[PDB]
Write a protein that binds this DNA or RNA. Structure first.
Ligand SMILES: *[C@@H]1O[C@H](CO)[C@@H](O[C@@H]2O[C@H](CO)[C@@H](O)[C@H](O)[C@H]2NC(C)=O)[C@H](O)[C@H]1NC(C)=O
Ligand SMILES: *[C@@H]1O[C@H](CO)[C@@H](O[C@@H]2O[C@H](CO)[C@@H](O)[C@H](O)[C@H]2NC(C)=O)[C@H](O)[C@H]1NC(C)=O
Ligand SMILES: *[C@@H]1O[C@H](CO)[C@@H](O[C@@H]2O[C@H](CO)[C@@H](O)[C@H](O)[C@H]2NC(C)=O)[C@H](O)[C@H]1NC(C)=O
Ligand SMILES: *[C@@H]1O[C@H](CO)[C@@H](O[C@@H]2O[C@H](CO)[C@@H](O)[C@H](O)[C@H]2NC(C)=O)[C@H](O)[C@H]1NC(C)=O
Ligand SMILES: *[C@@H]1O[C@H](CO)[C@@H](O[C@@H]2O[C@H](CO)[C@@H](O)[C@H](O)[C@H]2NC(C)=O)[C@H](O)[C@H]1NC(C)=O
Ligand SMILES: *[C@@H]1O[C@H](CO)[C@@H](O[C@@H]2O[C@H](CO)[C@@H](O)[C@H](O)[C@H]2NC(C)=O)[C@H](O)[C@H]1NC(C)=O
Ligand SMILES: CC(=O)N[C@@H]1[C@@H](O)[C@H](O)[C@@H](CO)O[C@H]1O
Ligand SMILES: CC(=O)N[C@@H]1[C@@H](O)[C@H](O)[C@@H](CO)O[C@H]1O
Ligand SMILES: *[C@@H]1O[C@H](CO)[C@@H](O)[C@H](O)[C@H]1NC(C)=O
Ligand SMILES: *[C@@H]1O[C@H](CO)[C@@H](O)[C@H](O)[C@H]1NC(C)=O
Ligand SMILES: *[C@@H]1O[C@H](CO)[C@@H](O)[C@H](O)[C@H]1NC(C)=O
Ligand SMILES: *[C@@H]1O[C@H](CO)[C@@H](O)[C@H](O)[C@H]1NC(C)=O
Ligand SMILES: *[C@@H]1O[C@H](CO)[C@@H](O)[C@H](O)[C@H]1NC(C)=O
Ligand SMILES: *[C@@H]1O[C@H](CO)[C@@H](O)[C@H](O)[C@H]1NC(C)=O
Ligand SMILES: *[C@@H]1O[C@H](CO)[C@@H](O)[C@H](O)[C@H]1NC(C)=O
Ligand SMILES: *[C@@H]1O[C@H](CO)[C@@H](O)[C@H](O)[C@H]1NC(C)=O
Ligand SMILES: *[C@@H]1O[C@H](CO)[C@@H](O)[C@H](O)[C@H]1NC(C)=O
Ligand SMILES: *[C@@H]1O[C@H](CO)[C@@H](O)[C@H](O)[C@H]1NC(C)=O
Ligand SMILES: *[C@@H]1O[C@H](CO)[C@@H](O)[C@H](O)[C@H]1NC(C)=O
Ligand SMILES: *[C@@H]1O[C@H](CO)[C@@H](O)[C@H](O)[C@H]1NC(C)=O
Ligand SMILES: *[C@@H]1O[C@H](CO)[C@@H](O)[C@H](O)[C@H]1NC(C)=O
Ligand SMILES: *[C@@H]1O[C@H](CO)[C@@H](O)[C@H](O)[C@H]1NC(C)=O
Ligand SMILES: *[C@@H]1O[C@H](CO)[C@@H](O)[C@H](O)[C@H]1NC(C)=O
Ligand SMILES: *[C@@H]1O[C@H](CO)[C@@H](O)[C@H](O)[C@H]1NC(C)=O
Ligand SMILES: *[C@@H]1O[C@H](CO)[C@@H](O)[C@H](O)[C@H]1NC(C)=O
Ligand SMILES: *[C@@H]1O[C@H](CO)[C@@H](O)[C@H](O)[C@H]1NC(C)=O
Lengths: 709, 709
RNA sequence: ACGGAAAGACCCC
RNA sequence: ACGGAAAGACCCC
């Protein structure tokens, strides 16, 4: 019970992976895999042909992925018997034309043919596909649209058709009807026309003709799409006068962005004449130097938007003059990637319905007092990627509804107890990737409802005691990628409800044996996940009482440390532990020590990963207490021998991974070789490929002369 | 030619190291080392006794170190025959009393007995020490100063005696004279008096009585130290009225700093009455809340200083009122670790002789225009560890004499081409550990004479083209610990005098085979040392022409990378290479690839370190071309066999390190065992300690059969 | 968040 | 700059 080229997924035997195995012969590779296989992933190999009965013994397949291969030839019959298949992925291969290879795929719901070199599809290729809802042909070499229509027009269930990034220049002009179709995309083609007369799409809600070339499109006819809800003309040069509001009375969303800033502002008179007559229009995406502040004022008259996106309007440098006041309907406003350096109380005085605002990636160094104060209903505010070194507390006065504040990748140099008084309802605060060096006491005291706090990728060295007081409801705390080293007595004081604590990639290191006067996690009584991966010089000597107080912990990650020494009984408090990972120390005895009886109390452990540690041997009876152990991985070590002793008492074992080791083809492994092939309870990854250590190779553990013992 | 517990130093055979080897029997440990040994270091062991002829076969010793052991017993005779020894280190042992050992130490210049538990020294212990110049008794349990004087007073050459950190409470009161003594320290004792009536030190130049407690010393008499040039009373409470200037007419330097800030300001009238009558006083160290600004003004009248140190004067918050004008003689001024947040050109208007100024570790967020402008002779300025996010360019107007600027560990968020206009003579610029994310073009253009630029530990991701334009004289560039990955076409252009480039601990990583259109080091015509260590994910696939143009290179550091893949002929340009380190990848085949003929051109390579790579095998003929190879280290790998094949053609070899491997006691290692024990041309570290791989151990490769082979 | 874990990857485009 | 290379370190004080 282990295959050659493929492995089962550890947490579902019905999923099979054969990824990056240089597979060239499809049939051989899958010949030894179970008949009960529902998901098979063969991504990233060198498969070239799909023969007439490729999946004979695999008729239970539901999901087949052949992404990133060299498939250029799929024989008729290839997918016969695959009547339960709902997904077929053929992305990134060498397919130039599509033939009648699809018989049997009577349940296929989605077919992905993106990223090939297709020019034509045979008229009858898709006939067996009576359930096909989604078809992707993006990234191909198609210029003949008539031929595609021939191939898809009779599909009974086809809802979404994607032709993005092809070479279609003209639409088709013989009368036809695709009645199931809801989504259609011509993005990134070279359309000269948008005349849909001869094409009836009664149920189309979403059309894209975005990014379609240099030549201006004048020939536009959309009457035949009466249900159309979103029209995407982003980066498409279209004479907007030839658009007709009469043909767009169901439109809810429009995208009129330029391709590049060079193209310049749109004529608001033209735009408003169109937009002003679309009574259902509520979303306008209006990007890339399409307008200035004054044009926003005009737009506000022509329209009644819920969502306006003004991103990448380079001529927006300040907004201080009632620009949005004729738009009180606004719920969501995006002003990201402009050139804004000043914004105040006068621009959005009347936006009392605004709940989401994106100001990220501008030139804000600061904001004046009461700038955001009219927005009494704001729930999401993003200021990410502004050159802000300091928070002007008064700019956020009265934002009592705010639930999420994103300040990631700003330049914030300091915060304190006065920084967040105005956000009593905040739930998520992202301070990641700033420049914060110390955390002062009470900095987050007002944030009574905070659920998630991100402080990662700062330069934190010093955490004052009571830094996190008031965070009674905090569930998640991310402190990854800082320079933290030791823990103060009352560091984690107010955090009794904390579920997740992430401290990986700091400098939490002990250079000698210690018994801490104050175990750092002692107050975290609800903690379920602890990350201590990759301390710069490894955690090294783990203090003997390091994990005291952590009886609720379920997952401990100590992987990627240069060294981890657990000499004593450090895991004794961890009675509810479910998953433990100590992988990647990379040179056994020097980098890893585990006391012989370290795992004794881990009677609920389900997962144990000790991979890439270059282990040379196993400690006797180390794992014998692990009753509930289901997944045991020793992948990428230097183990030479495994036997009944190592595996003693693992009653619940069902995945045991000893791939990437040095198992010797001698009698020492005779019990293992027979048991590993024969057990039906335990899966063993790539077992049938494990090579003999003999320098001559050309021989497998699996074929070991049993007779010699 | 290989020893058991010790090894020779790779670059001077006369140096022997025996560090952290758990040595307990000194004689046994040193029994196999050469008679030509001059430096012997046995630091960090558990040696307890030194028997009567411990160094019998080692009479050539000059430098002997027994630091960090458990020596409590040194027999009479221990150091016999050691007539060339000039240094003996016994620091950090268990010595409680010093007996009459030391016979034979007739050249000993320095004897270190610091960090023991010495209470007494026998009167005749140091009699053989006729050339002893320096004796350290710091960190011991000496309270009997009379007893110490008995032991040193007859030493004919004793110049320096250190008793810092002992328990001496009273001086001795029988008249004596140590005429050779120039330096004496009672720092960190518990002196209740400073009465030197009975102790004549006619040549004493330096006295420290620093850190002697709170109990105020009134009993002061120093007439007997007529040559005294420096008096250190830092942290010692002494009734300054009871000091006499009559007895201190040769004094050049004094330290009157407080112990803690609590002690408060000194009485400036008392201070000045003393100080004003010392005609040679040129250095005053004056720290820890000893004065305020106004006190500086009074001090300026009593004195004519060349160096004034006012560090840690917490009441110095602003200086804007002629504080220093009456001290125009100042050459060096330190004002670090005060609470300074404002300073301007009015405080130091007349300081035209100032050449060094330290403002580090204050609270400067900025400086006003022209603050530093009067200091026209300033050569050195430190502003380290101020919360400065941006440089006010006008604050430095006219500092044309400045040679070194230290801005390390400030909060600097941006600099540009206007940032360094005022420093045409700058030679060293330290910008490490700021918050700089991108480097703009022309940033260092004015610095025509710059030699060393430190930008380490910033957040550099983007280096604009021409970032280093104008740095034609640059010798050293430190860009370690940033986030660099790719370099613009001409980034390292114009740096043709660059000697040293440090790019370690960035993200310089290629995930596939590449042949770079523009190799980044191609213009570095003088580059001698290149550091590329520890890229976050390793350099991985080294581009085929990555080292193009580096024919002048002598040292290439590629260590500490998670992976290094050198598939082709990357090292072919490196014809002058002398040292190569690719250590610490940590798992042979997965993390390290070296083309079979990669070393073909390194005909001048002297040093090759391939350590800690978990290597299992050696590639045939990989090293056959290394004529000049002298040092070859394979320390800490998994090598099982070494033989004639590997060492083929290594004509210049003199050090071959295969310690920490897995060498098998079989016939495969017969050639190696015979060659390694017998060759006198090549040293092999710890050879006689190499154990047999049998799990029972208790056997050495050195004592291997031979009979069946 | 390549902070890859269905992980030890030459990861193309 | 433990950024330890006289290096793979339980590095105390
Ligand atoms: C191979 O295919 C499997 C499914 O057959 C992919 O599985 C998904 O994996 C992600 C995590 O990677 C999960 O969050 C999804 O729920 C999984 N989907 C299903 C249908 O199980 C798998 O990721 C693929 N792997 C690769 C490398 O291509
Ligand atoms: C119209 O089509 C454009 C062009 O594809 C869409 O742009 C993408 O939008 C997604 C989600 O916002 C981004 O993550 C992609 O990076 C965009 N791609 C490009 C090439 O810009 C645009 O979102 C569509 N407009 C609407 C309203 O759907
Ligand atoms: C601001 O939002 C509110 C709340 O969603 C809008 O009021 C609602 O409008 C719908 C449709 O007219 C009604 O059925 C609800 O009864 C209204 N709710 C309330 C609380 O009155 C309001 O129309 C929005 N304002 C603007 C300018 O569009
Ligand atoms: C052991 O003793 C030797 C001297 O015998 C020490 O050598 C010095 O090493 C430093 C660099 O670490 C050099 O810059 C000095 O020149 C060396 N001194 C001499 C006299 O050679 C060595 O550091 C000691 N090793 C340890 C770990 O204590
Ligand atoms: C004398 O004792 C003092 C005080 O203990 C020593 O000073 C300190 O040095 C330690 C050890 O490196 C540091 O951790 C402390 O920060 C220092 N404290 C103070 C008060 O400065 C001093 O080094 C000893 N002197 C000698 C020469 O042994
Ligand atoms: C007088 O003694 C003091 C206190 O012992 C010396 O202070 C030390 O100074 C050195 C050099 O600046 C520092 O590296 C140490 O941190 C200091 N040690 C302590 C314990 O403070 C002081 O330098 C001496 N004064 C003079 C004028 O030499
Ligand atoms: C970044 C950019 O291209 N800005 C353009 C500007 O060049 C042009 O004059 C104008 C035309 O409307 O639109 C704006
Ligand atoms: C020690 C510990 O926290 N164990 C928990 C226990 O508190 C809880 O009762 C149970 C679910 O009922 O899950 C487990
Ligand atoms: C794959 O292997 C089988 C078994 O040897 C062989 O019959 C068949 O020809 C191979 N198919 C391909 C694609 O070459
Ligand atoms: C399908 O299953 C049967 C039964 O094991 C087997 O004999 C047959 O060869 C299988 N077909 C292929 C091509 O794997
Ligand atoms: C379809 O048939 C043509 C012509 O026989 C062939 O070139 C092509 O490989 C086939 N396509 C696929 C993917 O099977
Ligand atoms: C379409 O083309 C553009 C340009 O390369 C690309 O960025 C985009 O991801 C492509 N979309 C698809 C679905 O292939
Ligand atoms: C289709 O249009 C609607 C708006 O009417 C939009 O919300 C939705 O995301 C669009 N779907 C796609 C996949 O373009
Ligand atoms: C908006 O900003 C500009 C530039 O600061 C200023 O001149 C103008 O008066 C402001 N507008 C109003 C009406 O406040
Ligand atoms: C608008 O800003 C001004 C000036 O900063 C402020 O005084 C005023 O209270 C603000 N108005 C409102 C309603 O928030
Ligand atoms: C160390 O070993 C030698 C010889 O094996 C022995 O004679 C000597 O007495 C030992 N020294 C000590 C201090 O135990
Ligand atoms: C010193 O060397 C002599 C002569 O080689 C040797 O016989 C003797 O054992 C050595 N003495 C000690 C104590 O190592
Ligand atoms: C002691 O030092 C001198 C000075 O170099 C040297 O010539 C002499 O040979 C040395 N003697 C010993 C004991 O090695
Ligand atoms: C000196 O002699 C004393 C008393 O006999 C003894 O306890 C001690 O070990 C000796 N000290 C040293 C360093 O030899
Ligand atoms: C110092 O000590 C001597 C005795 O040694 C004593 O007579 C004298 O009074 C003391 N000097 C002072 C200033 O107290
Ligand atoms: C001795 O004093 C002089 C100043 O007179 C000073 O330069 C030197 O550093 C001192 N030496 C020591 C070890 O303190
Ligand atoms: C400095 O001394 C003054 C009195 O001279 C005192 O008021 C103040 O507390 C001192 N500063 C500190 C930090 O102790
Ligand atoms: C110096 O600065 C302080 C604080 O800004 C100010 O109050 C004081 O008046 C200034 N004094 C002079 C002499 O300018
Ligand atoms: C300043 O330094 C010069 C040059 O060394 C010297 O001659 C002059 O006396 C100094 N001026 C004062 C006031 O010390
Ligand atoms: C001192 O600074 C003031 C204020 O910046 C400036 O006006 C003046 O020119 C400066 N004086 C000198 C001589 O540096
Ligand atoms: C390398 O070394 C030689 C001899 O030391 C020197 O003359 C030459 O300039 C160097 N070659 C290069 C490529 O810089």
């Amino acid at each position: 019970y282990g295959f050659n080229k493929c492995t089962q997924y550890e947490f579902d035997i019905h999923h099979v992976l054969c990824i990056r195995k240089k597979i060239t012969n499809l049939t051989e590779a899958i010949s030894d895999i179970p008949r009960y296989t529902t998901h098979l992933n063969l991504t990233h190999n060198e498969i070239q042909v799909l023969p007439p009965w490729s999946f004979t013994n695999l008729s239970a397949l539901v999901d087949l992925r052949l992404e990133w291969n060299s498939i250029w030839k799929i024989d008729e019959g290839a997918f016969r018997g695959l009547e339960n298949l709902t997904l077929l992925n053929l992305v990134e291969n060498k397919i130039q034309s599509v033939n009648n290879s699809f018989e049997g795929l009577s349940s296929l719901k989605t077919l992905l043919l993106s990223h090939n070199q297709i020019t034509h599809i045979h008229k009858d290729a898709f006939t067996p596909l009576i359930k096909l809802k989604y078809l992707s042909l993006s990234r191909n070499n198609i210029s003949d649209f008539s031929g595609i229509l021939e191939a898809v027009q009779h599909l009974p269930c086809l809802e979404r058709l994607d032709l993005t990034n092809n070479s279609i220049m003209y639409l088709d002009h013989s009368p036809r009807s695709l009645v199931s179709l809801t989504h259609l995309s011509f993005e990134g083609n070279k359309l000269r026309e948008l005349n849909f007369s001869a094409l009836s799409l009664p149920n189309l809600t979403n059309l894209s003709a975005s990014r379609n070339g240099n030549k201006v499109i004048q020939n536009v006819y959309l009457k035949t799409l009466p249900q159309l809800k979103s029209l995407n003309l982003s980066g498409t040069v279209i004479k907007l006068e030839n658009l007709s509001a009469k043909h767009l009375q169901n439109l809810r969303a429009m995208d009129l962005s330029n391709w590049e800033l060079r193209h310049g502002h749109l004529d608001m008179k033209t735009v408003c004449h169109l937009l002003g007559n679309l009574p259902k229009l509520e979303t306008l995406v209006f990007q890339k130097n399409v307008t200035n502040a004054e044009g926003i004022k005009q737009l506000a008259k022509c329209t009644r938007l819920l969502f306006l996106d003004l991103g990448q309007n380079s001529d927006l440098i300040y907004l201080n003059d009632s620009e949005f006041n004729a738009l009180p309907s606004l719920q969501k406003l995006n002003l990201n990637k402009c050139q804004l350096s000043f914004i105040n109380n006068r621009t959005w005085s009347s936006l009392q319905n605004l709940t989401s605002l994106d100001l990220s990636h501008n030139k804000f160094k600061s904001f004046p007092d009461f700038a955001f104060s009219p927005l009494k209903h704001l729930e999401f505010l993003s200021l990410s990627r502004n050159p802000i070194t300091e928070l002007n507390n008064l700019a956020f006065s009265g934002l009592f509804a705010l639930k999420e504040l994103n300040l990631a990748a700003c330049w914030i140099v300091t915060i304190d107890r006065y920084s967040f008084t105005q956000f009593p309802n905040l739930e998520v605060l992202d301070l990641g990737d700033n420049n914060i060096r110390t955390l002062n006491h009470g900095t987050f005291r007002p944030l009574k409802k905070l659920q998630s706090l991100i402080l990662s990728h700062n330069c934190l060295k010093i955490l004052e005691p009571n830094s996190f007081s008031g965070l009674t409801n905090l569930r998640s705390l991310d402190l990854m990628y800082n320079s933290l080293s030791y823990f103060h007595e009352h560091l984690f004081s107010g955090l009794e409800k904390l579920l997740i604590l992430k401290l990986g990639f700091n400098k939490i290191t002990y250079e000698t044996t210690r018994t801490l006067q104050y175990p750092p996690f002692i107050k975290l009584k609800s903690l379920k996940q602890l990350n201590l991966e990759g301390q710069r010089h490894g955690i090294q000597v783990v203090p003997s009482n390091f994990f005291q107080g952590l009886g609720s912990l379920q997952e401990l990650l100590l992987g990627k440390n240069p060294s981890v020494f657990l000499d004593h009984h450090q895991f004794d408090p961890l009675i509810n532990l479910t998953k433990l990972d100590i992988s990647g120390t990379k040179d056994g005895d020097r980098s890893l020590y585990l006391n012989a009886s370290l795992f004794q109390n881990l009677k609920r452990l389900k997962i144990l990963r000790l991979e890439n540690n270059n282990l040379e041997s196993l400690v006797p009876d180390m794992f014998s207490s692990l009753q509930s152990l289901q997944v045991f991985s020793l992948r990428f070590n230097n183990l030479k021998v495994i036997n009944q002793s190592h595996l003693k008492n693992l009653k619940s074992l069902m995945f045991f991974d000893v791939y990437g080791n040095k198992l010797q083809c001698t009698c020492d492994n005779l019990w293992f070789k027979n048991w590993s092939m024969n057990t039906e309870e335990v899966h063993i990854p790539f077992l049938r490929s494990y090579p003999c250590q003999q320098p001559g190779s050309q021989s497998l553990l699996i074929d070991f002369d049993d007779a010699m013992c």
